[PDB]
Amino acid sequence: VEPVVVIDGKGHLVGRLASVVAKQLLNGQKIVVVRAEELNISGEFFRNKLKYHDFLRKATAFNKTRGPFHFRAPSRIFYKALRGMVSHKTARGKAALERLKVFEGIPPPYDKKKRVVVPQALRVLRLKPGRKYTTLGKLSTSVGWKYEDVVAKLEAKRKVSSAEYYAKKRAFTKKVASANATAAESDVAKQLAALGY
């Protein structure tokens, strides 16, 4: 219900994460997807490996440039599973997509804001315990995208830059928590209970 919805990508299914996004982009709800390389796919690591190559070789014969492209990056392999859902030929599906922006890891502006999840996506609430899964990073790093470890570095960086944060944020609430209870018992506190709050 907010101007720019920031979806965190960890713990999601490439299929069922995009399916809700494709509709949330036709309602005029802006989205920026972040931390893609931890996104997941049903089935084992080897299936997706050959879910892919058989699409990797589909390039048009008489010239390779103008054939169907193949994007190795962790983003686009999601962004390809998305742009198919939206129908983009008529101008609606074109200007509709620029509501959407995809990223790997996190970009500079959009880490500072609260990062959400979609209840019906997560690998934890769908797949059966004991079933396998595939980390899209593990996939795209193997099928010829490059930079994963360099992205894994920045993640292993900002986690620390956000670590000192949470302490200063929590320790602040530690004051306010009992300070929420230091004003209790008062004649106004008895009424808020009768008033429900």
Add this chain to the structure above:
Amino acid sequence: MAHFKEYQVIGRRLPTESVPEPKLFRMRIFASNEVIAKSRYWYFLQKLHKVKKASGEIVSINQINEAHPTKVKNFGVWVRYDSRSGTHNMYKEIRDVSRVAAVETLYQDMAARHRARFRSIHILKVAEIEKTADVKRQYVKQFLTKDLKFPLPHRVQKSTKTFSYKRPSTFY
């Protein structure tokens, strides 16, 4: 087939003026309404006695309710079912509350594992087993044991909104 009702039906044939009072008959039909009972009834006469709806009549149609919805009961069920490769006997046991819902639990089964439609599945009989320890299969024997305790692993709760900010867990 639907939420069921266990019907009894009594056919008397049609008396000829030479023959008053035929011996009647009655069968316990599992059907989803008044009519489907009557028809599914006549189906069992034609394959037993030569008589059929043309020469027949129905005395009464009376729903039956379980006299004890209270107690959990163990139902042995003999099932003759036609299928692709031939016809076969079965004996499957059901742990279910009442006779009329005990059969509904069965079509969900027999139309899953053995791929038989409602058209192809007769019900030969339904009977409760008095004492335990007379039970056949393990999977009915499974729950007869003393004071069962189990957790439900890996909870899920149906969600309404398309966004939930808290990273919902399975704790339970």
Add this chain to the structure above:
Amino acid sequence: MKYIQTEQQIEVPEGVTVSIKSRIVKVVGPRGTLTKNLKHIDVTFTKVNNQLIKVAVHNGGRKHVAALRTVKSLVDNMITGVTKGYKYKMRYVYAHFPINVNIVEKDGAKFIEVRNFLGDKKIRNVPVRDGVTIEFSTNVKDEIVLSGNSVEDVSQNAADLQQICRVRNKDIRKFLDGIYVSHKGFITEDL
């Protein structure tokens, strides 16, 4: 049919300590520390008291129970690994060509060097897996013996040395030359 719930029993002798948090399994004993991650296999641990610790699966299927079982056998093989220890007696087998086995330090990584195999001109080399020290047996001619902690260490490195000796495109039922894992022992002399 989903057998409702089952369980197995792990048992701990006095001087060894399991530590299980999440599904991570630590072990500490006379032979040192072992660590293992079972998180892929989804089981629940029950600790009654020390020597009695029960593993259980609820509402699972055939395969899932089949996984519980081997989880038992795994962790228990670690425990009896950290008391006893693991030792493999391998004996050399050679016909006309004696096989040289050096131990060589190369960048401190402990490479086992095999020379004169089948009188070949090639040099053979294998990395030693971590934790396993290797001895050459006294008063047994042409024997090499491996000593280590976990079963995967000793077993994996041992068998790897076994399969470095394959013969190439000769008869495999005539030339028997090679190195073979024969007797699987435990490090301590008694057991």
Add this chain to the structure above:
Amino acid sequence: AESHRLYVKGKHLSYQRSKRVNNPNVSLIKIEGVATPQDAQFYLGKRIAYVYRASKEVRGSKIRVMWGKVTRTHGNSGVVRATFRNNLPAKTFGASVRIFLYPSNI
């Protein structure tokens, strides 16, 4: 009271349509904060007004409005059928539209 919205905001959406046909006379409106039509009966008859900025100024005003009212619920998810004096331009999909509270059936 820095929020002066007296209207329930809502997002315009696709026309009444089959797969290969659409009928512009009945637009669909999705209302924020609604789930089932059993809940959504309260919004029936509430007059809707689409508000779009313009280029020319007429009637001494730089902004124009197309009035319209709700007919009935659409599907289980609370999507709402809406008519108008004149069908929406179709240039608006996912554009916001204002549901006034009047007439109040309360």
Add this chain to the structure above:
Amino acid sequence: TDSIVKASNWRLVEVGRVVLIKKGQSAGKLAAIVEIIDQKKVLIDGPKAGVPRQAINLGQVVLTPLTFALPRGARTATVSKKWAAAAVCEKWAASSWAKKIAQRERRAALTDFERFQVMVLRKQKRYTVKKALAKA
């Protein structure tokens, strides 16, 4: 340094578990399992909460941290009686859980006027708290 195997401690279905029903024609009443059938559908009665004896799927029901022990297959007349001295109700209204449900149910029934009152009183409070954290 002992085992230190921690918990993974579930609440457990058992004969006598007391269940909360949040969906269906009952929707928000306490009940208690009579005797469990199988992995899913169970038999329950809430007798003081009004829900009759019946079979119910687990998807419709939620388990509560409260418990009281029962003989298997106990009849409803017995369920009210074992229900009685177990102090089950006060247990239930005592948990913060039921306090939330009762709280919000008591919220959405506020007239707009008392909403206004809540506004003014929350300003009354927010001032005293803004003071309250300066010194400490």
Add this chain to the structure above:
RNA sequence: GGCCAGCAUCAGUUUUGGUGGCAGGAUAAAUCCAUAGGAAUGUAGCUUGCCUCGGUAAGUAUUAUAGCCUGUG
């Protein structure tokens, strides 16, 4: 004395709820009560025997600080 509007009351066509009344049903079945019998995935209680002063392994034992089932009402 033209156009666009709104409101009220009607009318036709219809959809959305509420909500009462009455009849059917093995003149509902159940739950609930009186009522006897019968079993145990046998509670009390008994006792052996293991067992840190308590918990326990066995049968007795069909109701005792549980109860359920089977019937007739």
Add this chain to the structure above:
RNA sequence: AGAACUGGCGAUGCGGGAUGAACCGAACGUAGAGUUAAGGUGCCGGAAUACACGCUCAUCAGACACCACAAAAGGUGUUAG
């Protein structure tokens, strides 16, 4: 290629079968409103990622007629008898 009892297509649109004259429902003066058939109910498409019980993981899965492919034989793979 050749015939029989019907029905269609030619001489006929519309919705569905992605698409296609003979498939399914239906036979159109022009508007309005309402309710349905066939088909569907992840997203592209409007509509329940609705409920229930189950069964299957496939290092060439399956996906609903006419419609556009598959067999003989094997497998303590698995599930039920």
Add this chain to the structure above:
RNA sequence: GCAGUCAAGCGUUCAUAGCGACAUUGCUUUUUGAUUCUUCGAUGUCGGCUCUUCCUAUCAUACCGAAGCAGAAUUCGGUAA
């Protein structure tokens, strides 16, 4: 043309190393036919030279497994174009 299923026998002894009749189920279009649905107000019709590309039911090479494989030579098969 190719691929199976079973197996009497041959294969020293010996159905199965390799053969493989007797039958028997399929696949392919690369021949040759059947049909003639489309083009006689014309799609220029054999082969060669030329030049890429593709499918493998791979001839050689990489890596292996069986052999009636001692070595050598050779045969049968798999991942592979």
Add this chain to the structure above:
RNA sequence: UUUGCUCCACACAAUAUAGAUGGAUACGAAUAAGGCGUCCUUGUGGCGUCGCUGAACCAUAGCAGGCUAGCAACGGUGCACUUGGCGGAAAGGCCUUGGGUGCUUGCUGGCGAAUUGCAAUGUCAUUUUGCGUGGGGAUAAAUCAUUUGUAUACGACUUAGA
């Protein structure tokens, strides 16, 4: 090269706007596991609590916000300065030092807002483009033509020339 050009304010029109109307209200990891607190030998620690949906937390009373009074606190803020530190994955931000000016519904006050005439967005969100006004800051390049060739079909490329 008509005194143009860039930057900043003002001021005015136009010019449009895939489309505001309280707040995008910042840990990581597991989820057959955790968060939150408390205690210690600080641990793959203890003890308590909590999570079953943001149906929340903060903000939210003043003609779009009027005008003066008083009560307590020394807060919350508004604006513009300062203070220093931090920020590179698309840092253009965060946090902060000290002030100044303004509001205060934290509490009690006074007067006005009625004819927009029984509703009609009732227009107070923005980008852009231009124009005058105002104050700073600067005051050159490229192509053609000539010319070479390691460049060459013609363009392109590479040279050279106060």
